[PDB]
Design a protein around this ligand. Sequence first.
Ligand SMILES: *[C@@H]1O[C@H](CO)[C@@H](O[C@@H]2O[C@H](CO)[C@@H](O[C@@H]3O[C@H](CO)[C@@H](O)[C@H](O[C@H]4O[C@H](CO)[C@@H](O)[C@H](O)[C@@H]4O[C@H]4O[C@H](CO)[C@@H](O)[C@H](O)[C@@H]4O)[C@@H]3O)[C@H](O)[C@H]2NC(C)=O)[C@H](O)[C@H]1NC(C)=O
Ligand SMILES: *[C@@H]1O[C@H](CO[C@@H]2O[C@@H](C)[C@@H](O)[C@@H](O)[C@@H]2O)[C@@H](O[C@@H]2O[C@H](CO)[C@@H](O)[C@H](O)[C@H]2NC(C)=O)[C@H](O)[C@H]1NC(C)=O
Ligand SMILES: *[C@@H]1O[C@H](CO)[C@@H](O[C@@H]2O[C@H](CO)[C@@H](O)[C@H](O)[C@H]2NC(C)=O)[C@H](O)[C@H]1NC(C)=O
Ligand SMILES: *[C@@H]1O[C@H](CO)[C@@H](O[C@@H]2O[C@H](CO)[C@@H](O)[C@H](O)[C@H]2NC(C)=O)[C@H](O)[C@H]1NC(C)=O
Ligand SMILES: *[C@@H]1O[C@H](CO)[C@@H](O[C@@H]2O[C@H](CO)[C@@H](O)[C@H](O)[C@H]2NC(C)=O)[C@H](O)[C@H]1NC(C)=O
Ligand SMILES: *[C@@H]1O[C@H](CO)[C@@H](O[C@@H]2O[C@H](CO)[C@@H](O)[C@H](O)[C@H]2NC(C)=O)[C@H](O)[C@H]1NC(C)=O
Ligand SMILES: *[C@@H]1O[C@H](CO)[C@@H](O)[C@H](O)[C@H]1NC(C)=O
Ligand SMILES: *[C@@H]1O[C@H](CO)[C@@H](O)[C@H](O)[C@H]1NC(C)=O
Ligand SMILES: *[C@@H]1O[C@H](CO)[C@@H](O)[C@H](O)[C@H]1NC(C)=O
Ligand SMILES: *[C@@H]1O[C@H](CO)[C@@H](O)[C@H](O)[C@H]1NC(C)=O
Ligand SMILES: *[C@@H]1O[C@H](CO)[C@@H](O)[C@H](O)[C@H]1NC(C)=O
Ligand SMILES: *[C@@H]1O[C@H](CO)[C@@H](O)[C@H](O)[C@H]1NC(C)=O
Ligand SMILES: *[C@@H]1O[C@H](CO)[C@@H](O)[C@H](O)[C@H]1NC(C)=O
Ligand SMILES: *[C@@H]1O[C@H](CO)[C@@H](O)[C@H](O)[C@H]1NC(C)=O
Ligand SMILES: *[C@@H]1O[C@H](CO)[C@@H](O)[C@H](O)[C@H]1NC(C)=O
Ligand SMILES: *[C@@H]1O[C@H](CO)[C@@H](O)[C@H](O)[C@H]1NC(C)=O
Lengths: 725, 725, 207
Amino acid sequence: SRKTYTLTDYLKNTYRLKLYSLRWISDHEYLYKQENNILVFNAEYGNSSVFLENSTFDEFGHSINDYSISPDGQFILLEYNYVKQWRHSYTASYDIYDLNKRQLITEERIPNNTQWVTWSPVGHKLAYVWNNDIYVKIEPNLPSYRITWTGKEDIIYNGITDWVYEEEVFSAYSALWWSPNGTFLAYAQFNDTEVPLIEYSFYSDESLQYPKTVRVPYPKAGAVNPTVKFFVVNTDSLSSVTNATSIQITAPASMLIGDHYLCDVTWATQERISLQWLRRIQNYSVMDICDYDESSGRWNCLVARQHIEMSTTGWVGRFRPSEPHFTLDGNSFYKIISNEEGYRHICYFQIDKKDCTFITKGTWEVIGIEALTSDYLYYISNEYKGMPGGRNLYKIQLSDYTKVTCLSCELNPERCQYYSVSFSKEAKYYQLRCSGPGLPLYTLHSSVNDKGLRVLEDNSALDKMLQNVQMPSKKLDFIILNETKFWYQMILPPHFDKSKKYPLLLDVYAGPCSQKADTVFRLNWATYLASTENIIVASFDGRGSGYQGDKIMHAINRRLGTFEVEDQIEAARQFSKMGFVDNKRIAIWGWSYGGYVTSMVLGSGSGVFKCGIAVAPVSRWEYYDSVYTERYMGLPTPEDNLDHYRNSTVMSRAENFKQVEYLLIHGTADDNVHFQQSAQISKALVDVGVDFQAMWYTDEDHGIASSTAHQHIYTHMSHFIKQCF
Amino acid sequence: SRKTYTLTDYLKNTYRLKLYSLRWISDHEYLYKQENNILVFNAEYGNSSVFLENSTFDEFGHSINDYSISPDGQFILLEYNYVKQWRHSYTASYDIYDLNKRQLITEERIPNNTQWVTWSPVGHKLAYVWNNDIYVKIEPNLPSYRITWTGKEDIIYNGITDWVYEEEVFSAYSALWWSPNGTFLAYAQFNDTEVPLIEYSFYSDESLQYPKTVRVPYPKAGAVNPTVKFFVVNTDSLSSVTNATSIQITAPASMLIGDHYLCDVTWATQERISLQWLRRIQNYSVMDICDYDESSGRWNCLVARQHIEMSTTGWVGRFRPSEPHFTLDGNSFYKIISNEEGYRHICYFQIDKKDCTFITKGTWEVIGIEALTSDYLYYISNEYKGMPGGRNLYKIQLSDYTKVTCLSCELNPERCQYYSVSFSKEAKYYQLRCSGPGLPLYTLHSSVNDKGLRVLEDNSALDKMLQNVQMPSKKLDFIILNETKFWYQMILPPHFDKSKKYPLLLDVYAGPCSQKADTVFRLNWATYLASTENIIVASFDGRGSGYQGDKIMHAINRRLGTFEVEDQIEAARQFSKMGFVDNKRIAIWGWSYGGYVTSMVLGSGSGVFKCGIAVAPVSRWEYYDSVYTERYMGLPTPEDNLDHYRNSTVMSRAENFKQVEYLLIHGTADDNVHFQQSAQISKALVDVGVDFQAMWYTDEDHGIASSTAHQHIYTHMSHFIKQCF
Amino acid sequence: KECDFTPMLVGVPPQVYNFKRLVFTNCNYNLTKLLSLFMVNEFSCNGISPDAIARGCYSSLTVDYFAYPLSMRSYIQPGSAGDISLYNYKQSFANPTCRVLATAPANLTLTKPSAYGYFQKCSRVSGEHNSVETPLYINPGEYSICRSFSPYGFSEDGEVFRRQLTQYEGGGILVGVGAKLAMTDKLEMGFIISVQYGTDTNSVCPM
Ligand SMILES: *[C@@H]1O[C@H](CO)[C@@H](O[C@@H]2O[C@H](CO)[C@@H](O[C@@H]3O[C@H](CO)[C@@H](O)[C@H](O[C@H]4O[C@H](CO)[C@@H](O)[C@H](O)[C@@H]4O[C@H]4O[C@H](CO)[C@@H](O)[C@H](O)[C@@H]4O)[C@@H]3O)[C@H](O)[C@H]2NC(C)=O)[C@H](O)[C@H]1NC(C)=O
Ligand SMILES: *[C@@H]1O[C@H](CO[C@@H]2O[C@@H](C)[C@@H](O)[C@@H](O)[C@@H]2O)[C@@H](O[C@@H]2O[C@H](CO)[C@@H](O)[C@H](O)[C@H]2NC(C)=O)[C@H](O)[C@H]1NC(C)=O
Ligand SMILES: *[C@@H]1O[C@H](CO)[C@@H](O[C@@H]2O[C@H](CO)[C@@H](O)[C@H](O)[C@H]2NC(C)=O)[C@H](O)[C@H]1NC(C)=O
Ligand SMILES: *[C@@H]1O[C@H](CO)[C@@H](O[C@@H]2O[C@H](CO)[C@@H](O)[C@H](O)[C@H]2NC(C)=O)[C@H](O)[C@H]1NC(C)=O
Ligand SMILES: *[C@@H]1O[C@H](CO)[C@@H](O[C@@H]2O[C@H](CO)[C@@H](O)[C@H](O)[C@H]2NC(C)=O)[C@H](O)[C@H]1NC(C)=O
Ligand SMILES: *[C@@H]1O[C@H](CO)[C@@H](O[C@@H]2O[C@H](CO)[C@@H](O)[C@H](O)[C@H]2NC(C)=O)[C@H](O)[C@H]1NC(C)=O
Ligand SMILES: *[C@@H]1O[C@H](CO)[C@@H](O)[C@H](O)[C@H]1NC(C)=O
Ligand SMILES: *[C@@H]1O[C@H](CO)[C@@H](O)[C@H](O)[C@H]1NC(C)=O
Ligand SMILES: *[C@@H]1O[C@H](CO)[C@@H](O)[C@H](O)[C@H]1NC(C)=O
Ligand SMILES: *[C@@H]1O[C@H](CO)[C@@H](O)[C@H](O)[C@H]1NC(C)=O
Ligand SMILES: *[C@@H]1O[C@H](CO)[C@@H](O)[C@H](O)[C@H]1NC(C)=O
Ligand SMILES: *[C@@H]1O[C@H](CO)[C@@H](O)[C@H](O)[C@H]1NC(C)=O
Ligand SMILES: *[C@@H]1O[C@H](CO)[C@@H](O)[C@H](O)[C@H]1NC(C)=O
Ligand SMILES: *[C@@H]1O[C@H](CO)[C@@H](O)[C@H](O)[C@H]1NC(C)=O
Ligand SMILES: *[C@@H]1O[C@H](CO)[C@@H](O)[C@H](O)[C@H]1NC(C)=O
Ligand SMILES: *[C@@H]1O[C@H](CO)[C@@H](O)[C@H](O)[C@H]1NC(C)=O
């Protein structure tokens, strides 16, 4: 009778979720931005004041994209002329504004086309990267100093990462690390001389007569990989008369026999650093702790401080080895590792000894470590009610490990089950974020007695609007296979009835260490399908999924494309046994790795599914990058796992596609999963004679995030499902 | 009931048309291939003999693609290892077999990867091109001689054409011309030093890991064109001790003041040659006649022997200036030239005088000149019954121009209205080929008294097969617009009744100097649609069509996309008023240029059409080659025709596509109409928010001629038409 | 007196169409040493005996020199129709003259140029649609209009040049094409000596 969630509501963003983003600038105060005004809030009382007014922004003369404020509070950094590159990279222009004298600096400006810029932890020092070289400015007024002289385009990188390190190792563009009190600067250098190149065409605007080719250094499986070095420089001894000096730290002898990576960099104290190295065969890692010698001005790394992490059933860590959390004095640290039973918990180390002592145990996992004080440790786990999809905050006393307290278990049981936290400088105040089964909620608390101060956001405006709209519901449950529990989720249409029959659509990602069944509130394409078209949307977590144990996670080691494909089919059969699912109308779709699973399921010959959609899929594992593929599959070489590379190809199953419908979508300027992979799928289907549908998007990347392209793809997909059902 | 023509029959070639291909080797003998044997026939009596048996072929050990025989009948040339490059280009290996002493020559073999080989008109000389250089062999068993030393890949071409000359000017890959008795050899040279390059991607099978990039020199509208030179060499003075000497012939001074092309080369006598030149603005041409001086060894070209051809309404020639036909003494020639009324006829020239004298006149055009004898001249025209779609053979007496006789008009008034001819060496015998309304027929005739000797092929086998299959009929008629007649054709379903209503499909090319209404018998996709699906398929010739006069042909000069588009729309309105067409089901589709017209018709907003298909379309005239585009449009500059370049794009009509259904098909590796053009259409439609369908084919050229892709594309289009209706 | 023939043997020689002219008046000459210095492949005199011109008093003695290949000997003749006479250089028979074709022994102060060269064609274009095409022919003992461009030589054979003519010159567009020949082992030169002499004004006398 009333209105429902329509496709226009999803595409035009009629109903909005409103957030609360804050930046801690001290132990007591944080920053906020409201009506384009920056305000300073006192955490204890809620009093506020104006830090910067919007009238000053108007007189600058440009459009400001983002800002940064120095730790001391004397200068502000402005960013404009934003040009995007890859996922975490960009190019912009910067200006510096002085708050004390209320004016703009016009001497020794930061040059255009800058790649990165950062402040020091204390003071007002600057370090930026321009033309693949590093510069340091002690004062914003004074000229800059040059540190590196060997930068080159697409060959040598200083202070910034290449493709594989930005996408698969660091998940960031920066390769600069400041000392805790601003004395030293550490950076890494990458060399891409022998790495092959990938070429694709870019068409650009209508006025361009000749298309241009883009060349990117990209290593595929079994190719040549870049090399890495590490340097440390001292910024208090810089002089303009002579060039600066850098000291190199060498990898341990156990990693110099062959290829290796650099995983993590962390500062322990003012004169102590820690580095982690990983072999090309990603089941062996070594952590090194290094010190500074005043007599010689050199960094020494001795054998007795090294620690070794290895795995016999798979790879090290979830994606990469975890980071350590050092104490104030720097003689011990905490870290997350896997125990004998296969569950990840926190263990306590000493820099000299080899063994370490666990402090947590049980049939659950610890997601991360958030804060460390002199008496308590804060972490996030999924212990509560034995639900892997939940998240909660706990604290543990360092003197006695038996005393564990939950801080977010019982604040609001029916509304909130998924949590995140943000702490202050010395962990006196913290902010809790609840995505939750219900509406998001934001609150502020004090750590002295765990007392709730006030409420920052409740999303009361959205609740009033949604009372007039018919909305779906969410159900979370599990099934048992081989005496093992596997979890699933379902989105159900309004006024659900057990007697009636509904069509079913299956959403799959099924990547290693992934979770699709959780307790998060979302408004997306699935909401449209259930609310208006009365379609059930379901997801399933099977073998290869994470946050449940190493036995489940490591089941697909060296055997990608075998067990996760079969698990999805078995779940569909179980769903069909329930009374309310129609056997004739079942479909499947996915993105990226999900497209790979969707293609193999349709070509399996099971006869359970009818139609499917694949968006930017992977077809052959030799077309993907080395770091991701070799982690789970090994080298593509005859003496080590070459047969399985050939048996896991989508093109080998083209004949079975005659029994199902198929839709294929891919963007031409895609840089993560290249357009080559979809081109080879279509050629195989044409050779055998299968009828299918295809679609290409010009000058679109992996996400297809352009405003016009986003609306087009979802309208096209909606029509395909309606005719299939 | 009886069976009907099906899609499987068209794809698998169930019903075949038989041919009779012969090669004249003397004035009364020719060669034929029966059961992989070469036979010799005498035209006077019909006797037969064996020239080469199939056992010899099997002894070689390789698959032989084609054969050539020397004029003296002593050697045979064998070809294998065939690799195709462009429409008229390829590469292969060759061997020479001696017929008199019956063995294979194993000394001084022709190198692998040879580009072009040709025999001399008299004798057994050879000339071949390898690595862009010219070689000559006096005898098959002797070493070769080198003539050129400047050949280099993708820059300098000697003896062969580049992309633009091969596709748009010469329609051939060869650039070597022999003298009538083998004394001289003439060739052309091109540099492409400043011509831009076009780049696209090639994927090349599953085993390849990195895609390949293809670079081809390709001049677009307003870019830089190549340059041409002409040389003549003497083959009777070659020696091993010294390098050869080549004499250059320079273009006339009226052509050296700017850019120009070379369009025709012809030999007049043993020591006389004729060349034709064309300006970049293709409405001015010059013909030169040059002789040989024995005293100096040079070539002299006289100003008094030059002839000028101009056009005021448009360009010169149909596609390029026509070729001369010299007499025996070389002091006069015949040529086809448009007259004062705009109709093409024959002049008679004297090499020293400027004026013509026309020997034919009327409201019809002469198609071509076939043979010339000291008493009579033979040609093909469309005078009979005033039908522009017909062809017939005529003979004219040189002494008195009043006596004209038709040789194929009343041979069989039905079943044959379209003819072609092939003469012998001295024009003593000829073969007539009919592809008229009825099944093809081949006959042999004499020239002394014009009596039919025998029937070579009658396709009696196919007639019996088609007797039990329902087949469509064809109608040819005309309509009147603005007191002018325009011709059309219709394919009609079996048992046609004027009372009923049928859907209509319009097939469009509508290019300059093109004809889609004629009397030719075909078995194609249109036969399937009428026989099985009961659909009328129609074609219409409007303004811009050829073989009717310069008034109709030149109406689209400097205005492309204006008059030919509106003509197609008006034809559909006229078809609707006849009475047997359903107004609600009308569609249109086209190829190449037809795709351009189809897209412009759909975007006009007339509302007459419902759905349409465009395969490999042209989007913007600035993306296409210079020689073709500048012939009808001019340069793209503000001083000359730039406004109409911008107003004739498909991307400016994207908003009107919301009222129709659209299908877009293109090939990835297309070198003629690049994938860029279809990529820009998709981007424009996505920007305005229009829903459509698309399909790409991997590693397919302009024609999409691979067996697997040929069957796929015609199955996909059939589903689209059936769903639309 | 004491007229010097040193510039003839000093520096790089010029091309055929850019010939340099030296006039001698009231001076003593030594033709024997010049002829003996060069290896004379051909020595011909028209209207005067070779010994008479060597030991005969004259009024004005004019010598024009240029670099010319030995192979193309037949083109520089009193009767010829080659490209050398039509455009590049045409001999004059107004007064008796001698033509000398010799080779430098390479022991002198001569610098071998890059290559020989001459003009294949030189013409003028005008009309309604640039279609008149009137050729230009050089008068004897004169200069070619095409010589302004490419004064020293051609980079490659078959070069094409264009220039716009003024009202005084005649109007239209001038077009010309040049040729190139490879250099021989030793330098080859051509000398033309002509005298305009009066009986009572024989200022120049042999030494
Ligand atoms: C296919 O096309 C390409 C490109 O169009 C051709 O390559 C071009 O070749 C020409 C050769 O003429 C070349 O032009 C010369 O380039 C030289 C580079 O340094 C220039 O120095 C030179 O100028 C001199 O020569 C002119 C002609 O002689 C003179 O008129 C001019 O004043 C200059 O004079 C110098 O030389 C004389 C001696 O001759 C000396 O006394 C003077 O003091 C002075 O020093 C020409 O401009 C182009 O640059 C080339 N184009 C390029 C490389 O892009 C190619 O040749 C074509 N294919 C074939 C087979 O020919
Ligand atoms: C025949 O010519 C070749 C090539 O020389 C080039 O082309 C000629 C037409 C002319 O224009 C020459 O000036 C060009 O240089 C000669 O091969 C060259 O020989 C020289 C000397 O031995 C050597 O330095 C080069 O490297 C050679 N070039 C190549 C490409 O090999 C050949 O010697 C000539 N034949 C005779 C008999 O002289
Ligand atoms: C917000 O208000 C509180 C109390 O009104 C301020 O705290 C006082 O600050 C003044 C000067 O900063 C001190 O002299 C007082 O001793 C403070 N009193 C208390 C109880 O803390 C606070 O500074 C204000 N903050 C802002 C940002 O305006
Ligand atoms: C710092 O190092 C750079 C390069 O290592 C020095 O720059 C070089 O100086 C020498 C001597 O003048 C030049 O020959 C090089 O060409 C310079 N290289 C570059 C890349 O510019 C620079 O001189 C050093 N600074 C000081 C103070 O010595
Ligand atoms: C053509 O058919 C005739 C059969 O009569 C033969 O041709 C004869 O050839 C010989 C040899 O040159 C001549 O002397 C005869 O005069 C020819 N006969 C006639 C009637 O012209 C022969 O069998 C056949 N030849 C070929 C090449 O097929
Ligand atoms: C060939 O085409 C050109 C381009 O249209 C013609 O040049 C034009 O000629 C007319 C007549 O004098 C002038 O009014 C225009 O200004 C010219 N256009 C340009 C761009 O110069 C040329 O006349 C045509 N040739 C012939 C023989 O008609
Ligand atoms: C600028 O700040 C003032 C301060 O409250 C506010 O009232 C005003 O709305 C702001 N302007 C804009 C455009 O938001
Ligand atoms: C950045 O480019 C602008 C545009 O030319 C220029 O005005 C400005 O000075 C540049 N910035 C620097 C630091 O040179
Ligand atoms: C920063 O740390 C270094 C390392 O001990 C120390 O020497 C220096 O004095 C510190 N700076 C300040 C301002 O305390
Ligand atoms: C990068 O590597 C190449 C060889 O792979 C080496 O020659 C080069 O010196 C390296 N770059 C630097 C800055 O050392
Ligand atoms: C795992 O590490 C061990 C110890 O370094 C090594 O022997 C083994 O080969 C590694 N796994 C694989 C699959 O190579
Ligand atoms: C259960 O075990 C059987 C046989 O051991 C196996 O085929 C199947 O894949 C297993 N299923 C799961 C979910 O582990
Ligand atoms: C070879 O020629 C003979 C003689 O006519 C014929 O019978 C046979 O069929 C031919 N075979 C092939 C494979 O061409
Ligand atoms: C062509 O290639 C084959 C195979 O490599 C070789 O045997 C033959 O000699 C080649 N042809 C010539 C003329 O060298
Ligand atoms: C071929 O033509 C040339 C050119 O006139 C002539 O000299 C020669 O005699 C003719 N015949 C032969 C056999 O070369
Ligand atoms: C006939 O003339 C009218 C009047 O301008 C015009 O609109 C129409 O396009 C013409 N049709 C044809 C076929 O020439």
